[PDB]
Design a protein around this nucleic acid. Structure first.
Ligand SMILES: [Mg+2]
Ligand SMILES: [Mg+2]
Ligand SMILES: [Zn+2]
Lengths: 204, 175, 52, 163, 198, 190
RNA sequence: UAGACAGCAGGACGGUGGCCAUGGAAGUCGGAAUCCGCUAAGGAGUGUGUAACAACUCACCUGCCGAAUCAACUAGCCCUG
C-alpha cells in the first residue's frame, strides 16, 4: 500500500495541509514528540546535542518514529532510564496525494494517503538534553539515527544551556542575580520595566 | 576572480558624510590581487560583510602598491584561510617559503586548486605573517633549516628533444 | 590419539585464523583489514569456529 | 538534619575495608569518618578495644556508625573463616608467615561457621551458607589427607541443625 | 590515567631521595611480585620499602639541587629491572637480611639451578595414571604391593644446565621448586661513600 | 611530501668479504659464495672502511613507498651473510592418526617420495630447488632436515611439501594429517 | 628521553550468588543496576560452554628492543558497491 520515498522526497508542490478543503486523510504514525524524564529542572541536564539538516527536502512520519526508537533504546542501555530528555522538533503538516491506476490519465487528482514534513537547511530535527559525562554516548545515539533518513545530516554541540537560548557561561551568574527564574523545564527572563510590586515580591 | 601573478595593494576608504555625521571613520585593508581595478572591488566585498556600507555610499581615498622591504632575504610565511568545499565551510593554516609576500600567496592559490580543487571565488584570506625558523609546525619547510645542507641533482631528463630529432647517440642521464 | 604438542602445531595452520564476513577468506589471527580488493579492505571480521 | 544541625535520625551502617589493624594510615580515615564527630585518637582507641580476641582476626571491616562508642562485631568473613580460627594470639610483630600454618583441619568450623552466619546470603536450608563460605579455596586447607578441588562432591552430615 | 599518580612523583621520589640519607637498591630478576607483595610480613615501615619505575635514569633533575652524592652512580646499574628499598639503619644487619630475604619464589621455568642436585630420597607424590614418566629414564621401579619405594642413591643433575620442559613441568606440578629466587641485595648507598657489601 | 635523504647501514664481520658492481652484490665466505642483483630499486650503494668494514645504503628525494625499500635491501644482506657464514636449517615433522607416512630420498638430496598419506595408493613426488639438500633426521622418528645457504630456496622447498601433503573434501578441523614445519634454525649455533 | 607506543614475559582475590531472575545466571537471552578494600592493580567482571563450575579469558604493574607518538573527525584523486 505504501510506496518508496524517492517518489516523494523533493519539495515540488505547494503546501496542501489538512483543513476544511482537504478531508478524508488518515492520522500520522508518530504521535509522541518527547521522551525521558521530561520534568527535570534546568540545572540537572545542561548539555544539549543536536541533529542538523543540510538539504531542502521532505521527511516522513515513519522515518521520525523509527529514528525516535533507535535512539531511545541505545540511550537507555547506555546511561539509564532517566539520564536524559529527548525532543523532536518537526511536525508532519503537509499532505501527499496518490493517483491509483487500479480511463488512464483523465481526471487526475489524487487521494490523501500520507503525511510528511518539510525541511529547510539549518533547521533542527532532533535534540537531546543530558549531563556532561555522557557526551560521547549522545553522539553515538544520533549517529545510529541518520541511517533512517534520506539525505546528508550532521551533528553539533550547542553553546547554549539545555533547551534554552542563553549562553552557558552567562546563565549561571545570571540566575544568582534574579534576572532568570527556573519555572519548570525552562526559565523566565524578566526586565527592569514593569511595576515594582514584582520587584518587592522578589528581593524578599 | 581569475589570477595571473599577484600583487599587494593598500586600500583605505570611507563612507560619505551627511548633515548628521561630519567626519566618519576611516578603514584600512591589505589586499592581494592582479591590479587596482579589481582590488577596489574586493574591498567593497569585505567591508560590506563586516560593516554596513556600499559603493554608492562611500569613496576610495587611497589605493596604492606596497613594495617588499627585503626582497633578497629568504623568509618563512604563514597563512590563515577560509574556503568552502562542496559540503561545508572550513578554516586552515598553511606555511611556505618565499622572498616576497605576493609570491607566497600566489603559491597558495595554485596549491589549493591541486589538493582540494578550489576556485579563487571560493577563498578568503585573513592574515599573513613572517614566521621565524622556529614556530613552523610543518615538516616540509623544516627540512631546509640546516646550516650545512647539501644534495645532488639525481636523474636528470633530456630537455631539448626536438633539437636533433633523429640522432645516433643514445643519451646520457648521469651528471 | 595424537601428541598434544604436534596437535597444537597442526591447529596453528588450520584452526587459528580470522575470517572476513564478505569474502569468506582466511587471515592471520592478528588482523583488522582484509587483503582482497573484492571487498575493499573492509574492516569487518570474525574468528573461525572451533570444533565442539 | 537538612535544615540545620538537628541530630534526629543518623544511625547508619557503612562499609570500610583494609583490615582492622593499627596501620600507618591507620585504616580509620574514610570519607564517612569526618561526618560523625570522631577525633583521630579516640576513634582508634574504640576500634582497638573492640577488636579484642574474638576477634583479632583480619576481616575486611564493618562499622555500625554510632556517635561515640561504635561496636563492630565480626563481619561475614567467609573466605577468611577458612583461616580465622588460626591458633591465637597473632596481633603484630610476629607475623613472618602470611597465612601458612595450614592447620584449620576442617572438622567443625565448616558447620559452625555455617550456622554462625545470620541467615546471610542464602535462599536454601544453609546450602549457600556452605557454598559461599567455600568459594575461596585458593590458599585454603582441609583434613590432613584431603585436598581442595577433588572433595567438593560429597556431604556426610545431617541438615537438621542448619538454621 | 597516570595524572595524579605521577603528579605525586613530580616531587615525591625527589623528596624521598633528598631528606632521608641512606638507602638500598634491590634488583628484581625474572620474578613474580609475590616477594614484593608479601615482603609486608618480613618487616614494616621501619623506614619504607617501595619498588617503583626506572626514574633512577632521571638524575640530572635530582643533582640539580645538589642534594646528596652517590646518586648519579647508578645509570649503568639500571637498564630495566631494578627497584629501590630504603633503610637508614644498621648496615651489616640489613646486609645479612636481603642476602636471602626472598621467600615466595614461584615461576614455572626460565631460572637457574643454583646448587648441586641430590638423591630424591622422599615421597613427593605417587600417581597411578601412567608409569611411562619413569620407564622413559630407566631407573629402578620395583613394585612392592602397589606402592613404589626407591632406595637407589645416584647422581642425576649437576650445576650448569639449561632447564627443559620435562623437569620444568616436574618442578611446577609436584610441589617442589628449588629453582627460583625472588629479589637480591647488590648495592650500597652510604649517603655518598661507595663500597661493596663484604 | 618529499624528503631529502634516508639512509641505513649494515656491518660486516672480518671473516667475510663482499664487493659490488653497482647494484650487483657478491658475497663470499666459508660456506661458499652468493650472488644477487638489485638493479630494480634505484639506490646508491657504497662501501667504506679498512678492507671495506661497513656498508651503507641511502636514497635521495623519495615518497612514502620508495623509502620503504631501504631497510628491505639491508634485511636481505644480513640473511645472505648469515647463510654463507652459518647456513640455514629447517626441521619438519609428520603427523598422523591411523595411517603413517613413509618418506624416502631417491637422489642424494633432490627427490622426495611421499607414500601412504591417508591410506592412498597414489604417490607424491617433489623436487628440491637446486642447492638444497634434504635428509631424514635422528633422535626423533618422524623428522626431516633441509640445509641450504639461500633461505629463499629452502623456504620455497619446504612449502612445496607442505602443500603437496594436504587433504581435500573433508573437515580439516579434525583431519589434521600432514607435514608441518617444526622450527627454523641454523647449521651452526656458534 | 620521567624511557610511552607495537610486540615477547608474572595476572585478573575478598564482604560478594551485590541484586533481579531458579527452568538456568557463584559475570553468564538479560533488565532497574553498578559500593567497598588486598596490593602494585584485579571491573558488583568482557564473548566463549552453559545444573553450576573451578576457570578460558576482555582494565593493572615486573624486564628485551625502544620515542616523537596516539586517538577521533573531515575533504580531494583512486578503489569496492
Ligand atoms: Mg505540481
Ligand atoms: Mg530469546
Ligand atoms: Zn574480504
Amino acid at each position: 500500500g505504501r510506496r518508496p520515498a524517492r517518489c516523494y522526497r523533493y519539495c515540488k508542490n505547494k503546501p496542501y495541509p489538512k483543513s476544511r478543503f482537504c478531508r478524508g486523510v488518515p492520522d500520522a504514525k508518530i504521535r509522541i514528540f518527547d521522551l525521558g524524564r521530561k520534568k527535570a529542572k534546568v540545572d540537572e541536564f545542561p548539555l544539549c546535542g543536536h541533529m542538523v539538516s543540510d538539504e531542502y527536502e521532505q521527511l516522513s512520519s515513519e522515518a521520525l518514529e523509527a529514528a525516535r526508537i533507535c535512539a531511545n533504546k541505545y540511550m537507555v542501555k547506555s546511561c539509564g532510564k532517566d539520564g536524559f530528555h529527548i525532543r523532536v522538533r518537526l511536525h508532519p503538516f503537509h499532505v501527499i496525494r496518490i493517483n491509483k491506476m487500479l480511463t488512464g490519465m483523465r481526471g487526475a487528482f489524487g487521494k490523501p494517503q500520507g503525511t510528511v514534513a518539510r525541511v529547510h537547511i539549518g533547521q533542527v530535527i532532533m535534540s537531546i538534553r543530558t549531563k556532561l559525562q555522557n557526551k560521547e554516548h549522545v553522539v553515538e545515539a544520533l549517529r545510529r539515527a541518520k541511517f533512517k533518513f534520506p539525505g546528508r545530516q550532521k551533528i553539533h554541540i550547542s553553546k547554549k544551556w539545555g533547551f534554552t537560548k542563553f549562553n552557558a557561561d552567562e546563565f549561571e551568574d545570571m540566575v544568582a542575580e534574579k534576572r532568570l527564574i527556573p519555572d519548570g523545564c525552562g526559565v523566565k527572563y524578566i526586565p527592569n520595566r514593569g511595576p515594582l510590586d514584582k520587584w518587592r515580591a522578589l528581593h524578599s | 576572480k581569475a589570477s595571473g601573478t599577484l600583487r599587494e595593494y593598500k586600500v583605505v576608504g570611507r563612507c560619505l558624510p551627511t548633515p548628521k555625521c561630519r567626519t566618519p571613520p576611516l578603514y584600512r585593508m591589505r589586499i592581494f590581487a592582479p591590479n587596482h581595478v579589481v582590488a577596489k572591488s574586493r574591498f567593497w566585498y569585505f567591508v560590506s560583510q563586516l560593516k554596513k556600507m556600499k559603493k554608492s555610499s562611500g569613496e576610495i581615498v587611497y589605493c596604492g602598491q606596497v613594495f617588499e622591504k627585503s626582497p633578497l632575504r629568504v623568509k618563512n610565511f604563514g597563512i590563515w584561510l577560509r574556503y568552502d568545499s562542496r559540503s561545508g565551510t572550513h578554516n586552515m593554516y598553511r606555511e611556505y617559503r618565499d622572498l616576497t609576500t605576493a609570491g607566497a600567496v600566489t603559491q597558495c592559490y595554485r596549491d589549493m586548486g591541486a589538493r582540494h580543487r578550489a576556485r579563487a571565488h571560493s577563498i578568503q584570506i585573513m592574515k599573513v605573517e613572517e614566521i621565524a625558523a622556529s614556530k613552523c609546525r610543518r615538516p616540509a619547510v623544516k627540512q631546509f633549516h640546516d646550516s650545512k645542507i647539501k644534495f645532488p641533482l639525481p636523474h636528470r631528463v633530456l630537455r631539448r628533444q626536438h633539437k636533433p630529432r633523429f640522432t645516433t647517440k643514445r643519451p646520457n642521464t648521469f651528471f | 590419539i595424537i601428541e598434544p604438542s604436534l596437535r597444537q602445531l597442526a591447529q596453528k595452520y588450520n584452526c587459528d585464523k580470522m575470517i572476513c564476513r564478505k569474502c569468506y577468506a582466511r587471515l592471520h589471527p592478528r588482523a583488522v583489514n582484509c587483503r582482497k580488493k573484492k571487498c575493499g579492505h573492509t574492516n569487518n571480521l570474525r574468528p573461525k569456529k572451533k570444533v565442539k | 538534619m537538612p535544615p540545620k544541625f538537628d541530630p534526629n535520625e543518623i544511625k547508619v551502617v557503612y562499609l570500610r575495608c583494609t583490615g582492622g589493624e593499627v596501620g600507618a594510615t591507620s585504616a580509620l580515615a574514610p570519607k564517612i569518618g569526618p561526618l560523625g564527630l570522631s577525633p583521630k585518637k579516640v576513634g582508634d582507641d574504640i576500634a582497638k578495644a573492640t577488636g579484642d580476641w574474638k576477634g583479632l582476626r583480619i576481616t575486611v571491616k564493618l562499622t555500625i556508625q554510632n556517635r561515640q562508642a561504635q561496636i563492630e562485631v565480626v563481619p561475614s568473613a567467609s573466605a577468611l573463616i577458612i583461616k580465622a580460627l588460626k591458633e591465637p594470639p597473632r596481633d603484630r610483630k610476629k607475623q613472618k608467615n602470611i597465612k601458612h600454618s595450614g592447620n584449620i583441619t576442617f572438622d567443625e568450623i565448616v558447620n559452625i561457621a555455617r550456622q554462625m552466619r545470620h541467615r546471610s546470603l542464602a535462599r536454601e536450608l544453609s546450602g549457600t551458607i556452605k557454598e559461599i563460605l567455600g568459594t575461596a579455596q585458593s590458599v585454603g586447607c582441609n583434613v590432613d589427607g584431603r585436598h581442595p578441588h577433588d572433595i567438593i562432591d560429597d556431604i556426610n552430615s545431617g541438615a537438621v541443625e542448619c538454621p | 590515567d597516570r595524572a595524579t599518580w605521577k603528579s605525586n612523583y613530580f616531587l615525591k621520589i625527589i623528596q624521598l631521595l633528598d631528606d632521608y640519607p641512606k638507602c638500598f637498591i634491590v634488583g628484581a630478576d625474572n620474578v613474580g611480585s609475590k616477594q614484593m607483595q608479601q615482603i609486608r610480613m618480613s618487616l614494616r615501615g621501619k623506614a619504607v620499602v617501595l619498588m617503583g619505575k626506572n626514574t633512577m635514569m632521571r638524575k640530572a633533575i635530582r643533582g640539580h639541587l645538589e642534594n646528596n652524592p652517590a646518586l648519579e652512580k647508578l645509570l649503568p646499574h639500571i637498564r630495566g629491572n631494578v627497584g629501590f628499598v630504603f633503610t637508614k639503619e644498621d648496615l651489616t644487619e640489613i646486609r645479612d637480611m636481603l642476602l636471602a630475604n626472598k621467600v615466595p619464589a614461584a615461576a614455572r621455568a626460565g631460572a637457574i639451578a643454583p646448587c648441586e642436585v641430590t638423591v630424591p630420597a622422599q615421597n613427593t607424590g605417587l600417581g597411578p595414571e601412567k608409569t611411562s614418566f619413569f620407564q622413559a629414564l630407566g631407573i629402578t621401579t620395583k613394585i612392592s604391593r602397589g606402592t613404589i619405594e626407591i632406595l637407589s642413591d645416584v647422581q642425576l643433575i649437576k650445576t650448569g644446565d639449561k632447564v627443559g620442559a620435562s623437569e620444568a613441568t616436574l618442578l611446577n606440578m609436584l610441589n617442589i621448586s628449588p629453582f627460583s629466587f625472588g629479589l637480591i641485595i647488590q648495592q650500597v648507598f652510604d649517603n655518598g661513600s661507595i663500597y661493596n657489601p663484604e | 611530501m618529499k624528503t631529502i635523504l634516508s639512509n641505513q647501514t649494515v656491518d660486516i664481520p672480518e671473516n667475510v668479504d663482499i664487493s659490488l658492481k653497482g647494484r650487483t652484490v657478491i658475497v663470499k665466505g666459508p660456506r661458499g659464495t652468493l650472488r644477487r642483483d638489485f638493479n630494480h630499486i634505484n639506490v646508491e650503494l657504497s662501501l667504506l672502511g679498512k678492507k671495506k668494514k661497513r656498508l651503507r645504503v641511502d636514497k635521495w628525494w623519495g615518497n612514502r613507498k620508495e623509502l620503504a625499500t631501504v631497510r628491505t635491501i639491508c634485511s636481505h644482506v644480513q640473511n645472505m651473510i648469515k647463510g654463507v657464514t652459518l647456513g640455514f636449517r629447517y626441521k619438519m615433522r609428520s603427523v598422523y592418526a591411523h595411517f603413517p607416512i613413509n618418506v624416502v630420498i631417491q637422489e642424494n638430496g633432490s627427490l622426495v617420495e611421499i607414500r601412504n598419506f591417508l591410506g592412498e595408493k597414489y604417490i607424491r613426488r617433489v623436487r628440491m630447488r637446486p642447492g638444497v639438500a634434504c635428509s631424514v633426521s635422528q633422535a626423533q622418528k618422524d623428522e626431516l632436515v633441509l640445509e641450504g645457504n639461500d633461505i629463499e630456496l629452502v623456504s620455497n622447498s619446504a612449502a612445496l611439501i607442505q602443500q603437496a601433503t594436504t587433504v581435500k573434501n573433508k573437515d580439516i578441523r579434525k583431519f589434521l594429517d600432514g607435514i608441518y614445519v617444526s622450527e627454523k634454525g641454523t647449521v651452526q649455533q656458534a
